[PDB]
Amino acid sequence: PVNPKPFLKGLVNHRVGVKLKFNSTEYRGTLVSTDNYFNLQLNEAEEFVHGTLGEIFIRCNNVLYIRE
Amino acid sequence: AAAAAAAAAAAAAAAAAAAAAAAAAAAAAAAAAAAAAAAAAAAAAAAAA
Amino acid sequence: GIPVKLLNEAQGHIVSLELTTGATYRGKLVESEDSMNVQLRDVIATEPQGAVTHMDQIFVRGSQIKFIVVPDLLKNAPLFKKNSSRPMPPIR
Amino acid sequence: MSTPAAEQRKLVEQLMGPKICKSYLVGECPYDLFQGTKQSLGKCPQMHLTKHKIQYEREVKQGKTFPEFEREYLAILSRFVNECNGQISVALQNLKHTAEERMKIQQ
Amino acid sequence: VSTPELKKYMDKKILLNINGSRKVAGILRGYDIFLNVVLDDAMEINGEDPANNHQLGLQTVIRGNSIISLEALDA
Amino acid sequence: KIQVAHSSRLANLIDYKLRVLTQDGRVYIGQLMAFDKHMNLVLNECIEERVPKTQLDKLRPRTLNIKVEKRVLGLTILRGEQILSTVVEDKPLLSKKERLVRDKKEKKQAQKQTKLRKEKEKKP
Amino acid sequence: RPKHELSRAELEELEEFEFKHGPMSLINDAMVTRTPVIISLRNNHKIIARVKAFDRHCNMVLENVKELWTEKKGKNVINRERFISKLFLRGDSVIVVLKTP
Amino acid sequence: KLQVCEVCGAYLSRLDTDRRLADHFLGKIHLGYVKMREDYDRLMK
Amino acid sequence: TRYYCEYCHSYLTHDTLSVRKSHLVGKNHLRITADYYRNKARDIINKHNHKRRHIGKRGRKERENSSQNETLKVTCLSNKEKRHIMHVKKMNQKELAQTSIDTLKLLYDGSPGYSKVFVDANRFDIGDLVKASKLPQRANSRSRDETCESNPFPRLNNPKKLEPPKILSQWSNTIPKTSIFYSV
Amino acid sequence: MVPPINCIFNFLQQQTPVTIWLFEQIGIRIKGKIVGFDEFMNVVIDEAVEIPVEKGTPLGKILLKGDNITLITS
Amino acid sequence: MKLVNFLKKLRNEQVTIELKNGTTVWGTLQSVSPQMNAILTDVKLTLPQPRLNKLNSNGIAMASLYLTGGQQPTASDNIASLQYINIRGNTIRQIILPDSLNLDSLLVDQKQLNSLRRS
Amino acid sequence: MNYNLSKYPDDVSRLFKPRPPLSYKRPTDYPYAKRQTNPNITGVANLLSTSLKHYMEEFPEGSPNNHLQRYEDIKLSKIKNAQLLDRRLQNPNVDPHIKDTDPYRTIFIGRLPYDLDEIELQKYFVKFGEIEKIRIVKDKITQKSKGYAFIVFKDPISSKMAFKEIGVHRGIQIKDRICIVDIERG
RNA sequence: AUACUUACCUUAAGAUAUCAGAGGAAAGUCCUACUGAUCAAACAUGCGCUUCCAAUAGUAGAAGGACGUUAAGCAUUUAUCAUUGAACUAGUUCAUUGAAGUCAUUGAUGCAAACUCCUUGGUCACACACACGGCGCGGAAGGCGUG
RNA sequence: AAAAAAAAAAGGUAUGUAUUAA
Ligand SMILES: [Zn+2]
Ligand SMILES: [Zn+2]
Ligand SMILES: [Zn+2]
């Protein structure tokens, strides 16, 4: 019976992919922290749409879904 | 009585409203009968004196 | 605000709608809320491409409304009085 | 109450977080009915939570059916039935007569 | 804040247009302040009435954001 | 044409004929009367002007004459969500002095109403 | 805990925490350390810049902005660059913001 | 001139006919007491 | 908040959809508001345009051409007269507002489909609405099923002959004095 | 009356599988087992697969945002 | 903190408000509402030309631009000049402020200090 | 209008007549189903981070933040305030302005007027019992009276009686001022 | 308007320019028809400040409209899908069955003109005066400045 | 050596019933 917010609290500092709603782009990286709006911070992220990205901030409105 | 109260009131409460209305009318008839009996008793008390 | 209060003042009168989808619903306004979502009665509908139909009852979401056309005689309605004198409010 | 997301969070918290109360398979409780009317006043005991209500109403399908809730629910309800009957008695005492029969004695 | 007033609509078979293209018809069950509307015996209307129409599920819920207009075909 | 006061906000301007731009590329021209927190406003006599898809190629860069199809809709109430920008077309039927006059007379009449109501309620 | 229960100062401590400890700490640490950031908008072109200020809504004030936008028609591409000294960016357009090494 | 309804303990005039009484029958007090009586009958069985 | 109803000028405290809906539907508020728009509507007809006059200098030519033209006499009624004639004219306009000639409905009264069309309660387009338009009727017919089988012969001492066409009161002396034939 | 999020809670505990349509722009529909939800109608789906619009790839336990939700259908 | 309170101190400055349409507005700036509603005075607002061998520009922004009444007939390119445009807040994308003003003086918010000075 | 489903009678309802139906104009915009913002946003590339170096070599050093130094000034100032409070906190058996006899009999007067006198305070304090010692707090930099004093009395019970009587009601009136009273507290 | 009966319901919070200095009840707060600076509003008041305000020495003209006519103007492009049978080239016509189907084809799109009619203005005063680009009285709309 | 109680309806809108003149 897990809800979304404890699900993000359980996914901290685990490898998580996040699919944005636009190009079917997903950022694969270790989650750092989340806001109350589910803003995302990531370390060692990689952009799949192939690249490697050091640190990332993702705004809440553009994400489609979050997976592990 | 149905056509008069059916317009404004919702149809789902129309049945229970109707039953409550009939019950109220019956109670009114009962009160009328009781008043009539009291009147008869008063007439008898006036005739005895 | 006054713009919504004028929509509440238009209840029971023929009004026109434009939804942001492009359609046009002209007919009589039954209900309206402060969220601007209204429901209309015995309304003629114009699809975005012009096909016109008729439906007896409709409910539309206020967020999708674009403009609402209201009977003109509501222009001089008391909502638009700038300097107006209200009495004292009752104490409760 | 100020925004719909707040009200909706309140409703979802009512859905997801002995307490007895509401009991019988149909609605009831003494308190929930009369809110806003002059008769009943404010906070009422325990908690009529939709989670417990869904559990119990689903146990109606489970059919475990142990009317201990109803045996507490008679102690709750019949007292209010008696209160209403008493208020009826008081009103019957009040209404019928006044200075009244004075003039009627006059008659 | 305020609940939308569908109170006369519920239990009546209703057609409502999802987004721009789609039109769903079903018997309205419940609704909320966001106008999220849950209905049963849903059917997705299309050009060919018996043919391209396909039922969705026993219970379907709709986000109020995708609701445009809601018409009841019923009393 | 018309010079708007160098500092004038949407509240300063009433009864001016405005020109309202929406997200869809159509315009509502008419007298503004009220508005609101989220900037949905009420126009008195307004006409929506539209550039057809066929005339649009005439606006792309090369005296141009555009046929702008427009329809008249009186006393509307716009929605703040659709509004994009607002421009001033004309100035009101009345001057500033005359509007001061009618404002003062309207206020005096309003006070007279409160007195006539108060003393009609008090004695009876 | 919902926001409508808290007092006026508890919101200030909450925003101070969210900026200091939270996702937007990526931008905050970028403002203090003078590290240039890359920002992708939803308009589909990307600014390489340096953040002088930021805010809750993510709208932020920038200095030495370099905008990069490409366009293609029928698979004919051209890359265009536009330089700006100082800028103010409304936060609803942005999607991803990364902190350069 | 009225008769007190056993259900809601409130007064009902005979001359106001039915269509006015419907407002009293659909109110929260009267409808609630209507349900509570039925619940007593439920619990007597 | 509190909802001030400016038509009635009376406040109602802590606005709610129920109480506000009840007040707006209320009979007193109804009369007050309807009368209000009756006044605000009669004003635009009552108000005189009073458009501004722009007087130019008459030229030497048209003063000479207009001087040879004789001066026409003007008629001006007395105050007591003009008050009465204004009353009459206004009451005549109010008459032309309400006329709405229905004679077609009188012609077809015995038609086989008269009950489905002109009764307007039992119609399709307007039929269902009239039911919800019926007043709450607080305190104190022509069904559609009719057929031609009733009233088979439309004339058996039943009908009244068609009402004569009206005439203007002013010009009523214009009528030909005598009819061509002898009516009973 | 059956409030909609009550119905969703009946999708959580009854463990019925659901198909859910997204916005018309994306072009995929998700299906899985709805576990829990928030006030914003953003839901966690266990054993979810993304179908383009039946060869879709399996996702996982995935949090899906409520902004893109159109239908939740059993 | 609300960074919009910064824009309210930028009053009476030359600015470009670059909107979501791609439409750009050069003008002198007047009072900015708390919702970022931006009201300007003497403005020249236009559309950029994507070159790319005739790539059709925004079709809605051309119509919205001709419908301001400020586009003059003899303009060869696509521009309009007018006085007093009022812009809704959610339409703004970027704002390019002049190079001359210093941020260190304007970026100090008096409420931020006031909270710290009082504690 | 014919039906006019309304509160108003027929004459008022026919007064609200709407304008004629709106004429149909074909839409010049994109249908709602086709409406979207720009898709296929190119993400931040390894090629973009490769183009970063052109920006980095051009603007290697960012402009200093002088609006943050206004905050770093006040916070460091607060830390220094805490350090001065630390200088005060380390400094009552040494003080010997406070070395007078047993603290149980020490009664503290405060809010006394700066123009007050030792005789009047000897009378007002002498009202509740005999006075053992008396000391008036004056600044160390100069003799101006601080407005507080310590009065040692022969018995602690009389000192408590003085605290309750004099200090518990309105403050004890002395000269033109109301003077609070309590225990030594130190 | 008064009295009685019944129904429906009840308080988002806070604040009213900022900055600085002096004073009253080491830290902070509150306060001073206290002192300065800046800002804002109202009211006055000025600028050789800027723009605009129609013929009568004539039957005109300027701005804006017509949801006006010529006008079936001229030039273009359009009028449903599926199933079965017959003929047919190797797609076409006719008949039957089903589905939906804004009206229009005198339409719709583009092009242009002529005519007619509506609303508006100081239709003010002095002047019919050979200059190198003023300094009549007002009204409308602004900008700037002082109090 | 110690001791003992509390002060209160509010008032808005709507519906029905009765009264306010030859
Ligand atoms: Zn309870
Ligand atoms: Zn009852
Ligand atoms: Zn009212």
PDB file of C-alpha atoms (C1' of nucleotides) in Angstrom, chain I residues 11-13 19 23 26-27 138 140, chain N residues 10-18:
ATOM      1  CA  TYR I  11     -27.170  41.826   2.768  1.00  0.00           C
ATOM      2  CA  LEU I  12     -27.170  38.070   3.211  1.00  0.00           C
ATOM      3  CA  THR I  13     -24.500  36.753   5.548  1.00  0.00           C
ATOM      4  CA  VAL I  19     -28.966  30.343   0.625  1.00  0.00           C
ATOM      5  CA  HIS I  23     -32.689  34.312  -2.300  1.00  0.00           C
ATOM      6  CA  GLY I  26     -37.234  34.352  -3.942  1.00  0.00           C
ATOM      7  CA  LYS I  27     -40.466  36.097  -4.870  1.00  0.00           C
ATOM      8  CA  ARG I 138     -46.255  26.581  -3.062  1.00  0.00           C
ATOM      9  CA  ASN I 140     -53.411  27.403  -2.173  1.00  0.00           C
TER      10      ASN I 140
ATOM     11  C1'   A N  10     -26.805  35.913  18.907  1.00  0.00           C
ATOM     12  C1'   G N  11     -28.696  37.650  14.119  1.00  0.00           C
ATOM     13  C1'   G N  12     -29.376  36.890   7.858  1.00  0.00           C
ATOM     14  C1'   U N  13     -32.325  34.941   3.686  1.00  0.00           C
ATOM     15  C1'   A N  14     -36.509  32.190   1.900  1.00  0.00           C
ATOM     16  C1'   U N  15     -41.689  29.882   2.404  1.00  0.00           C
ATOM     17  C1'   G N  16     -46.663  29.579   4.609  1.00  0.00           C
ATOM     18  C1'   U N  17     -50.417  31.814   8.277  1.00  0.00           C
ATOM     19  C1'   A N  18     -52.810  36.671  10.661  1.00  0.00           C
TER      20        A N  18
END
